[PDB]
């Protein structure tokens, strides 16, 4: 996309991660599995929910009847009424078509942005204790147990703690 993460440097998506839209997949000595990041998932949910409502509910109409009846000696104002009805039809069709075209692009970029930013929050924590092996994965230069995993996701990874071990494994 624009941010180049979805269908970009992260090739595909995970049918296994069912907790949310964005998350992690880890494996270490004591197991493996998926886990969604709810902080970014909820923000996207709260944001997309507000976006659909803003398109639906900023449309408010009043009671009106479109049916006007004109006899055979009123063809002029009957064609005028047709020009009004056909005029509103052309506008509301072009607006709705272009709106859904444009905002579908924006929404797919918004999900691309969230994956990119979620990736940078992890990269800027594991500065050189982990290896950017590409494909949106990090290989740690140290043993990272399930306690350590839950801290990278939480955003509280202790760099000075594991910097000692990762220095020597880099060789």
């Amino acid at each position: 996309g624009l941010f180049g993460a979805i269908a970009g440097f992260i090739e595909g998506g995970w049918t296994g991660m069912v907790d949310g839209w964005y998350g992690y997949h880890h494996q270490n000595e004591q197991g493996s599995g998926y886990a969604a990041d709810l902080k970014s998932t909820q923000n996207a949910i709260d944001g997309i929910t507000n976006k659909v409502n803003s398109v639906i509910e900023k449309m408010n109409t009043q009671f009106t009847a479109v049916g006007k009846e004109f006899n055979h000696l009123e063809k002029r104002i009957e064609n005028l009424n047709k020009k009004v009805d056909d005029g509103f039809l052309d506008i509301w069709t072009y607006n709705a078509e272009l709106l859904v075209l444009l905002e579908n692009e924006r929404t797919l970029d918004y999900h691309d942005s969230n994956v990119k930013n979620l990736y940078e929050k992890v990269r800027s924590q594991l500065k050189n204790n982990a290896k950017e092996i590409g494909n949106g994965c990090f290989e740690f230069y140290h043993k990272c147990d399930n306690t350590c995993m839950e801290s990278v996701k939480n955003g509280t990874y202790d760099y000075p703690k594991y910097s000692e071990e990762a220095k020597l494994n880099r060789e």
Partner: protein, 55 residues
């Protein structure tokens, strides 16, 4: 020209009467006098639907 076997014609007319007003008919012939009127009160403007769709 004959329309439903009638060489003649008959125009129809209508008008509204305000609450507390009078209407006067007067003719020496050719008047189709009213028999039933309608005490009405028209609410917001609506339309008319023409369709074979059932109710």
């Amino acid at each position: 020209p004959k329309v439903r076997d009638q060489e003649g014609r008959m125009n129809y007319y209508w008008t509204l009467v305000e609450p507390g007003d009078k209407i006067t008919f007067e003719a020496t012939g050719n008047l189709v006098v009213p028999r039933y009127a309608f005490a009405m009160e028209r609410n917001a403007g609506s339309g008319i639907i023409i369709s074979d769709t059932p109710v």
